Amino acid sequence: GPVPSRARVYTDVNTHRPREYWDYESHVVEWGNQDDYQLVRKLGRGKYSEVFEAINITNNEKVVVKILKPVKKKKIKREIKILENLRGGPNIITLADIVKDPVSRTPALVFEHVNNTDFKQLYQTLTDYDIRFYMYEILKALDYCHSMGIMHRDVKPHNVMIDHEHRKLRLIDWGLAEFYHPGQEYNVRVASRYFKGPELLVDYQMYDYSLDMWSLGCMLASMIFRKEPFFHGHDNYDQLVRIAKVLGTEDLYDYIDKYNIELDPRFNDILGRHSRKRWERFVHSENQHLVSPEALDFLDKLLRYDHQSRLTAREAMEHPYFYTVVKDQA
Ligand SMILES: O=C(O)c1ccc2c(c1)nc(NCCCCCCCCNCc1ccc(-c3ccccc3)c(Cl)c1)c1ccncc12
Protein backbone atom coordinates (compact mmCIF):
# COMPACT_ATOMS: atom_id res chain seq x y z
CA GLY A 1 0.00 0.00 0.00
CA PRO A 2 0.79 3.74 -0.10
CA VAL A 3 3.48 5.45 1.99
CA PRO A 4 2.19 7.56 4.91
CA SER A 5 2.65 11.32 5.10
CA ARG A 6 2.45 13.90 7.94
CA ALA A 7 1.94 17.62 7.61
CA ARG A 8 5.30 19.24 8.39
CA VAL A 9 3.69 22.21 10.15
CA TYR A 10 0.79 22.30 12.67
CA THR A 11 0.89 18.49 12.58
CA ASP A 12 -0.47 17.86 16.08
CA VAL A 13 -2.44 21.01 16.96
CA ASN A 14 -5.79 19.21 17.16
CA THR A 15 -4.52 16.35 19.33
CA HIS A 16 -3.52 18.82 22.07
CA ARG A 17 -6.97 20.46 22.03
CA PRO A 18 -10.01 19.51 24.11
CA ARG A 19 -12.10 16.89 22.38
CA GLU A 20 -14.94 19.41 21.78
CA TYR A 21 -12.69 21.43 19.47
CA TRP A 22 -12.74 18.88 16.66
CA ASP A 23 -15.41 16.32 17.63
CA TYR A 24 -17.98 18.38 15.71
CA GLU A 25 -20.42 15.49 15.26
CA SER A 26 -21.41 16.02 18.92
CA HIS A 27 -21.57 19.82 18.71
CA VAL A 28 -25.04 20.94 19.89
CA VAL A 29 -26.37 23.76 17.65
CA GLU A 30 -28.74 26.44 19.02
CA TRP A 31 -31.06 27.48 16.17
CA GLY A 32 -32.30 31.06 16.24
CA ASN A 33 -35.40 32.19 14.32
CA GLN A 34 -35.07 32.99 10.60
CA ASP A 35 -37.61 35.83 11.03
CA ASP A 36 -34.86 37.92 12.61
CA TYR A 37 -33.82 38.43 8.97
CA GLN A 38 -35.74 39.54 5.88
CA LEU A 39 -34.55 38.26 2.53
CA VAL A 40 -33.99 41.08 0.04
CA ARG A 41 -32.55 39.39 -3.06
CA LYS A 42 -30.69 36.34 -4.34
CA LEU A 43 -26.91 36.74 -4.64
CA GLY A 44 -26.16 33.45 -6.42
CA ARG A 45 -26.90 29.77 -6.04
CA GLY A 46 -24.66 26.71 -5.82
CA LYS A 47 -24.56 22.97 -5.42
CA TYR A 48 -24.69 23.09 -1.60
CA SER A 49 -26.54 26.34 -0.90
CA GLU A 50 -28.18 29.46 -2.12
CA VAL A 51 -27.21 32.87 -0.80
CA PHE A 52 -29.44 35.90 -0.25
CA GLU A 53 -28.96 39.47 0.74
CA ALA A 54 -31.07 39.99 3.87
CA ILE A 55 -31.39 42.73 6.47
CA ASN A 56 -31.56 42.12 10.20
CA ILE A 57 -34.78 43.86 11.24
CA THR A 58 -33.48 44.47 14.78
CA ASN A 59 -30.49 46.74 14.12
CA ASN A 60 -31.38 47.38 10.46
CA GLU A 61 -27.95 46.23 9.17
CA LYS A 62 -27.09 44.42 5.94
CA VAL A 63 -26.31 40.71 6.25
CA VAL A 64 -26.20 37.52 4.14
CA VAL A 65 -28.20 34.30 4.56
CA LYS A 66 -26.87 31.06 3.08
CA ILE A 67 -29.73 28.58 2.94
CA LEU A 68 -28.14 25.14 2.97
CA LYS A 69 -29.27 22.65 0.33
CA PRO A 70 -30.04 19.32 2.02
CA VAL A 71 -26.92 17.58 3.26
CA LYS A 72 -26.10 15.28 6.21
CA LYS A 73 -26.72 17.00 9.55
CA LYS A 74 -23.07 16.32 10.46
CA LYS A 75 -21.69 18.17 7.40
CA ILE A 76 -23.66 21.18 8.63
CA LYS A 77 -22.36 20.80 12.21
CA ARG A 78 -18.86 20.55 10.75
CA GLU A 79 -19.04 23.87 8.86
CA ILE A 80 -20.60 25.58 11.88
CA LYS A 81 -18.00 24.26 14.31
CA ILE A 82 -15.18 25.31 11.95
CA LEU A 83 -16.70 28.79 11.57
CA GLU A 84 -17.18 29.02 15.33
CA ASN A 85 -13.56 27.94 15.93
CA LEU A 86 -12.06 30.39 13.40
CA ARG A 87 -13.99 33.47 14.43
CA GLY A 88 -12.05 36.70 14.70
CA GLY A 89 -9.26 35.23 12.62
CA PRO A 90 -7.53 37.54 10.16
CA ASN A 91 -9.58 37.77 6.96
CA ILE A 92 -11.88 34.86 7.84
CA ILE A 93 -15.54 35.53 7.11
CA THR A 94 -17.53 36.07 10.30
CA LEU A 95 -20.46 33.84 11.18
CA ALA A 96 -23.04 36.16 12.72
CA ASP A 97 -25.87 33.74 13.43
CA ILE A 98 -27.42 30.34 12.69
CA VAL A 99 -31.15 30.06 12.01
CA LYS A 100 -33.83 27.80 10.60
CA ASP A 101 -37.02 28.82 8.81
CA PRO A 102 -40.09 28.23 11.02
CA VAL A 103 -42.26 26.55 8.37
CA SER A 104 -39.81 24.80 5.99
CA ARG A 105 -37.56 24.07 9.01
CA THR A 106 -34.49 24.32 6.69
CA PRO A 107 -31.15 25.31 8.28
CA ALA A 108 -29.32 28.46 7.23
CA LEU A 109 -26.25 30.44 8.26
CA VAL A 110 -26.11 34.22 8.57
CA PHE A 111 -22.84 35.90 7.53
CA GLU A 112 -21.37 39.37 7.69
CA HIS A 113 -21.76 41.36 4.49
CA VAL A 114 -18.83 42.27 2.22
CA ASN A 115 -19.11 45.03 -0.39
CA ASN A 116 -17.65 42.75 -3.06
CA THR A 117 -15.96 44.32 -6.10
CA ASP A 118 -16.83 43.34 -9.68
CA PHE A 119 -14.13 41.09 -11.13
CA LYS A 120 -14.51 42.80 -14.54
CA GLN A 121 -12.98 45.95 -13.02
CA LEU A 122 -10.72 43.80 -10.78
CA TYR A 123 -8.95 42.06 -13.71
CA GLN A 124 -7.51 44.82 -15.94
CA THR A 125 -6.54 47.72 -13.64
CA LEU A 126 -5.01 45.35 -11.03
CA THR A 127 -1.40 46.35 -10.47
CA ASP A 128 1.54 44.12 -9.60
CA TYR A 129 1.40 45.68 -6.13
CA ASP A 130 -2.28 44.83 -5.71
CA ILE A 131 -1.56 41.21 -6.63
CA ARG A 132 1.16 40.95 -3.99
CA PHE A 133 -1.06 42.77 -1.48
CA TYR A 134 -4.20 40.66 -1.64
CA MET A 135 -2.20 37.44 -2.07
CA TYR A 136 -0.47 38.28 1.21
CA GLU A 137 -3.92 38.78 2.75
CA ILE A 138 -4.97 35.29 1.66
CA LEU A 139 -1.90 33.78 3.33
CA LYS A 140 -2.92 35.53 6.56
CA ALA A 141 -6.21 33.63 6.36
CA LEU A 142 -4.54 30.39 5.32
CA ASP A 143 -1.80 30.44 7.92
CA TYR A 144 -4.28 31.28 10.69
CA CYS A 145 -6.73 28.51 9.83
CA HIS A 146 -3.94 25.99 9.28
CA SER A 147 -2.49 27.00 12.64
CA MET A 148 -5.94 26.38 14.07
CA GLY A 149 -5.78 22.82 12.73
CA ILE A 150 -8.10 23.42 9.77
CA MET A 151 -7.75 22.98 6.03
CA HIS A 152 -10.09 24.90 3.72
CA ARG A 153 -10.00 22.51 0.73
CA ASP A 154 -11.93 24.80 -1.63
CA VAL A 155 -9.53 27.67 -2.29
CA LYS A 156 -10.77 29.19 -5.57
CA PRO A 157 -11.43 32.74 -6.80
CA HIS A 158 -15.20 32.59 -6.27
CA ASN A 159 -14.39 32.10 -2.54
CA VAL A 160 -12.31 35.26 -2.00
CA MET A 161 -14.37 38.42 -1.53
CA ILE A 162 -12.45 41.64 -2.09
CA ASP A 163 -13.70 45.10 -1.07
CA HIS A 164 -11.27 47.02 -3.26
CA GLU A 165 -12.44 50.39 -1.92
CA HIS A 166 -11.51 49.51 1.69
CA ARG A 167 -8.77 47.03 0.61
CA LYS A 168 -10.43 44.24 2.62
CA LEU A 169 -10.40 40.53 1.81
CA ARG A 170 -12.48 37.69 3.29
CA LEU A 171 -11.99 33.93 2.75
CA ILE A 172 -15.46 32.35 2.49
CA ASP A 173 -17.35 29.04 1.99
CA TRP A 174 -16.14 26.61 4.64
CA GLY A 175 -18.57 23.94 3.47
CA LEU A 176 -15.69 21.72 2.47
CA ALA A 177 -13.27 22.63 5.29
CA GLU A 178 -12.13 19.75 7.53
CA PHE A 179 -9.92 19.16 10.59
CA TYR A 180 -6.36 17.96 10.11
CA HIS A 181 -5.43 14.78 11.97
CA PRO A 182 -2.07 13.04 11.40
CA GLY A 183 -2.60 9.81 9.50
CA GLN A 184 -6.24 10.47 8.52
CA GLU A 185 -7.25 9.51 4.98
CA TYR A 186 -9.59 12.02 3.34
CA ASN A 187 -12.07 12.17 0.47
CA VAL A 188 -10.24 13.32 -2.66
CA ARG A 189 -13.47 14.47 -4.35
CA VAL A 190 -13.06 18.00 -3.11
CA ALA A 191 -12.35 21.54 -4.30
CA SER A 192 -13.06 22.68 -7.87
CA ARG A 193 -11.56 20.99 -10.96
CA TYR A 194 -9.12 23.76 -11.84
CA PHE A 195 -7.71 23.97 -8.31
CA LYS A 196 -7.40 20.28 -7.42
CA GLY A 197 -3.90 19.41 -6.26
CA PRO A 198 -2.24 16.44 -7.95
CA GLU A 199 -2.87 14.46 -4.76
CA LEU A 200 -6.62 14.63 -5.34
CA LEU A 201 -6.19 13.85 -9.03
CA VAL A 202 -4.08 10.72 -8.36
CA ASP A 203 -6.22 9.66 -5.35
CA TYR A 204 -3.76 10.04 -2.49
CA GLN A 205 -5.98 10.45 0.57
CA MET A 206 -3.45 11.25 3.29
CA TYR A 207 -3.06 14.91 2.34
CA ASP A 208 -2.82 18.01 4.52
CA TYR A 209 -2.86 21.82 4.53
CA SER A 210 -0.38 21.75 1.62
CA LEU A 211 -3.48 21.15 -0.54
CA ASP A 212 -4.62 24.72 0.14
CA MET A 213 -1.16 25.84 -1.00
CA TRP A 214 -1.55 24.31 -4.47
CA SER A 215 -4.91 26.03 -5.06
CA LEU A 216 -3.21 29.33 -4.24
CA GLY A 217 -0.51 28.53 -6.78
CA CYS A 218 -3.22 28.03 -9.38
CA MET A 219 -4.67 31.46 -8.63
CA LEU A 220 -1.44 33.44 -8.55
CA ALA A 221 -0.53 31.62 -11.77
CA SER A 222 -3.76 32.61 -13.49
CA MET A 223 -3.42 36.27 -12.40
CA ILE A 224 0.15 37.05 -13.43
CA PHE A 225 -0.18 35.21 -16.75
CA ARG A 226 -3.75 36.51 -17.26
CA LYS A 227 -4.91 33.01 -18.17
CA GLU A 228 -8.19 31.98 -16.51
CA PRO A 229 -7.86 29.26 -15.53
CA PHE A 230 -4.19 28.39 -15.78
CA PHE A 231 -4.75 24.60 -15.92
CA HIS A 232 -7.84 24.20 -18.15
CA GLY A 233 -8.81 20.53 -17.96
CA HIS A 234 -11.89 18.87 -19.44
CA ASP A 235 -12.30 16.37 -16.54
CA ASN A 236 -10.35 15.22 -13.48
CA TYR A 237 -8.19 13.02 -15.71
CA ASP A 238 -7.33 15.62 -18.35
CA GLN A 239 -6.70 18.08 -15.53
CA LEU A 240 -3.72 15.98 -14.46
CA VAL A 241 -2.54 15.90 -18.09
CA ARG A 242 -2.76 19.68 -18.43
CA ILE A 243 -0.71 19.87 -15.24
CA ALA A 244 1.82 17.36 -16.56
CA LYS A 245 2.24 19.31 -19.80
CA VAL A 246 3.56 22.20 -17.64
CA LEU A 247 5.36 20.67 -14.62
CA GLY A 248 6.69 17.72 -16.67
CA THR A 249 6.07 14.00 -16.38
CA GLU A 250 9.39 13.11 -14.75
CA ASP A 251 8.51 14.80 -11.44
CA LEU A 252 4.99 13.33 -11.58
CA TYR A 253 6.23 9.79 -11.91
CA ASP A 254 8.82 10.36 -9.16
CA TYR A 255 5.99 11.63 -6.93
CA ILE A 256 3.91 8.54 -7.72
CA ASP A 257 6.94 6.32 -7.21
CA LYS A 258 7.93 7.97 -3.87
CA TYR A 259 4.53 7.71 -2.17
CA ASN A 260 3.95 4.33 -3.88
CA ILE A 261 0.75 5.57 -5.45
CA GLU A 262 -1.22 3.16 -7.60
CA LEU A 263 -2.19 5.20 -10.65
CA ASP A 264 -5.47 4.65 -12.48
CA PRO A 265 -5.39 2.48 -15.63
CA ARG A 266 -7.11 5.42 -17.38
CA PHE A 267 -3.98 7.51 -16.74
CA ASN A 268 -1.76 4.67 -18.01
CA ASP A 269 -2.28 6.02 -21.54
CA ILE A 270 -2.99 9.77 -21.61
CA LEU A 271 -0.17 11.30 -19.57
CA GLY A 272 2.52 10.30 -22.07
CA ARG A 273 5.89 12.02 -21.66
CA HIS A 274 6.41 15.78 -21.27
CA SER A 275 9.32 18.02 -20.29
CA ARG A 276 9.16 20.59 -17.51
CA LYS A 277 8.58 23.99 -19.14
CA ARG A 278 10.33 27.15 -18.03
CA TRP A 279 7.85 29.79 -16.98
CA GLU A 280 9.14 32.16 -19.68
CA ARG A 281 6.89 30.36 -22.20
CA PHE A 282 3.82 31.88 -20.53
CA VAL A 283 4.93 35.53 -20.34
CA HIS A 284 3.97 37.78 -23.27
CA SER A 285 3.32 41.50 -23.93
CA GLU A 286 -0.01 42.00 -22.20
CA ASN A 287 1.14 40.41 -18.90
CA GLN A 288 4.86 41.20 -18.58
CA HIS A 289 4.19 43.97 -16.05
CA LEU A 290 2.91 41.37 -13.53
CA VAL A 291 5.79 38.90 -14.07
CA SER A 292 9.13 39.28 -12.27
CA PRO A 293 11.92 36.95 -11.07
CA GLU A 294 10.34 37.13 -7.59
CA ALA A 295 6.76 36.18 -8.57
CA LEU A 296 8.07 33.40 -10.83
CA ASP A 297 10.33 32.13 -8.04
CA PHE A 298 7.50 32.23 -5.49
CA LEU A 299 5.06 30.62 -7.98
CA ASP A 300 7.47 27.76 -8.77
CA LYS A 301 7.76 26.99 -5.05
CA LEU A 302 3.97 26.65 -4.72
CA LEU A 303 3.09 24.39 -7.70
CA ARG A 304 4.76 21.04 -6.86
CA TYR A 305 3.40 17.52 -7.22
CA ASP A 306 4.95 16.52 -3.89
CA HIS A 307 2.81 18.26 -1.28
CA GLN A 308 5.64 18.02 1.27
CA SER A 309 7.87 20.36 -0.71
CA ARG A 310 5.24 23.08 -1.23
CA LEU A 311 5.85 26.22 0.78
CA THR A 312 3.81 26.51 3.97
CA ALA A 313 1.65 29.62 4.30
CA ARG A 314 4.18 30.99 6.80
CA GLU A 315 7.08 30.35 4.45
CA ALA A 316 5.19 32.01 1.60
CA MET A 317 4.66 35.03 3.81
CA GLU A 318 8.42 35.39 4.18
CA HIS A 319 9.17 35.14 0.47
CA PRO A 320 10.83 38.21 -1.14
CA TYR A 321 7.80 38.58 -3.41
CA PHE A 322 6.09 40.19 -0.38
CA TYR A 323 8.96 42.35 0.91
CA THR A 324 7.15 45.54 -0.11
CA VAL A 325 3.77 44.82 1.43
CA VAL A 326 5.53 43.79 4.65
CA LYS A 327 7.44 47.10 4.69
CA ASP A 328 4.35 49.16 3.84
CA GLN A 329 2.45 47.50 6.70
CA ALA A 330 4.60 49.43 9.22
O1 LIG B 1 -20.34 30.41 1.91
C1 LIG B 1 -19.95 31.38 2.68
O2 LIG B 1 -19.26 31.14 3.75
C2 LIG B 1 -20.28 32.85 2.30
C3 LIG B 1 -20.14 33.90 3.25
C4 LIG B 1 -20.45 35.24 2.88
C5 LIG B 1 -20.91 35.54 1.53
C6 LIG B 1 -21.05 34.50 0.60
C7 LIG B 1 -20.73 33.14 0.99
N1 LIG B 1 -21.51 34.76 -0.75
C8 LIG B 1 -21.81 36.03 -1.17
N2 LIG B 1 -22.26 36.20 -2.55
C9 LIG B 1 -22.79 35.10 -3.39
C10 LIG B 1 -22.05 34.94 -4.77
C11 LIG B 1 -20.53 34.83 -4.61
C12 LIG B 1 -19.80 36.13 -4.96
C13 LIG B 1 -18.58 35.91 -5.91
C14 LIG B 1 -17.22 36.29 -5.27
C15 LIG B 1 -16.03 36.26 -6.23
C16 LIG B 1 -14.96 37.34 -5.97
N3 LIG B 1 -13.62 36.82 -6.34
C17 LIG B 1 -12.96 37.54 -7.48
C18 LIG B 1 -11.44 37.76 -7.25
C19 LIG B 1 -10.79 38.97 -7.56
C20 LIG B 1 -9.37 39.13 -7.34
C21 LIG B 1 -8.57 38.11 -6.77
C22 LIG B 1 -7.09 38.24 -6.51
C23 LIG B 1 -6.56 39.45 -5.99
C24 LIG B 1 -5.18 39.61 -5.75
C25 LIG B 1 -4.27 38.55 -6.01
C26 LIG B 1 -4.75 37.33 -6.52
C27 LIG B 1 -6.13 37.19 -6.78
C28 LIG B 1 -9.29 36.95 -6.48
CL1 LIG B 1 -8.40 35.70 -5.81
C29 LIG B 1 -10.67 36.74 -6.69
C30 LIG B 1 -21.69 37.16 -0.27
C31 LIG B 1 -22.02 38.50 -0.69
C32 LIG B 1 -21.87 39.56 0.25
N4 LIG B 1 -21.43 39.34 1.55
C33 LIG B 1 -21.12 38.07 1.97
C34 LIG B 1 -21.24 36.93 1.07
UniProtKB/Swiss-Prot annotation:
Residue intervals of the Protein kinase domain: 37-322
Biological process per Gene Ontology, one example term: negative regulation of proteasomal ubiquitin-dependent protein catabolic process
Transmembrane segments: none
Compartmental location: Nucleus
GO molecular function: ATP binding; Hsp90 protein binding; identical protein binding; kinase activity; protein serine kinase activity; protein serine/threonine kinase activity
Tissue: Expressed in gastric carcinoma tissue and the expression gradually increases with the progression of the carcinoma (at protein level).
Highest taxon listed in the record's lineage: Eukaryota
Residue positions binding ATP: 43-51, 66
Main location: nucleus
Catalytic activity: L-seryl-[protein] + ATP = O-phospho-L-seryl-[protein] + ADP + H(+); L-threonyl-[protein] + ATP = O-phospho-L-threonyl-[protein] + ADP + H(+)
EC number: 2.7.11.1
Region (Interaction with beta subunit): 34-39
UniProt keywords, alphabetically: Apoptosis, ATP-binding, Biological rhythms, Cell cycle, Disease variant, Intellectual disability, Kinase, Nucleotide-binding, Nucleus, Phosphoprotein, Serine/threonine-protein kinase, Transcription, Transcription regulation, Transferase, Wnt signaling pathway
Activity regulation details: Constitutively active protein kinase whose activity is not directly affected by phosphorylation. Seems to be regulated by level of expression and localization.
One Gene Ontology cellular component annotation held by this UniProt entry: cytosol
PTM description: Phosphorylation does not directly affect casein kinase 2 activity, but may contribute to its regulation by forming binding sites for interacting proteins and/or targeting it to different compartments.
Class of the enzyme per the UniProt entry, highest EC level: transferase
Catalytic machinery residues: 154
Other notes: Can use both ATP and GTP as phosphoryl donors. Phosphorylation by casein kinase 2 has been estimated to represent up to one quarter of the eukaryotic phosphoproteome. Casein kinase 2 has been found to be increased at protein level and up-regulated at the level of enzyme activity in the majority of cancers. However, elevated levels of casein kinase 2 are present in certain normal organs such as brain and testes.
The protein's assembly and partners: Heterotetramer composed of two catalytic subunits (alpha chain and/or alpha' chain) and two regulatory subunits (beta chains). The tetramer can exist as a combination of 2 alpha/2 beta, 2 alpha'/2 beta or 1 alpha/1 alpha'/2 beta subunits. Also part of a CK2-SPT16-SSRP1 complex composed of SSRP1, SUPT16H, CSNK2A1, CSNK2A2 and CSNK2B, which forms following UV irradiation. Interacts with RNPS1. Interacts with SNAI1. Interacts with PML (isoform PML-12). Interacts with CCAR2. Interacts with HIRIP3.
Family named by the database record: Belongs to the protein kinase superfamily. Ser/Thr protein kinase family. CK2 subfamily.
Record function comment: Catalytic subunit of a constitutively active serine/threonine-protein kinase complex that phosphorylates a large number of substrates containing acidic residues C-terminal to the phosphorylated serine or threonine. Regulates numerous cellular processes, such as cell cycle progression, apoptosis and transcription, as well as viral infection. May act as a regulatory node which integrates and coordinates numerous signals leading to an appropriate cellular response.
Clinical disorder: Okur-Chung neurodevelopmental syndrome: An autosomal dominant neurodevelopmental disorder characterized by developmental delay, intellectual disability, behavioral problems, hypotonia, speech problems, microcephaly, pachygyria and variable dysmorphic features.
Protein known as: Casein kinase II subunit alpha
Species name: Homo sapiens (Human)
Name of the gene this protein is made from: CSNK2A1
Range of the intact protein held here: 3 to 332 of 391
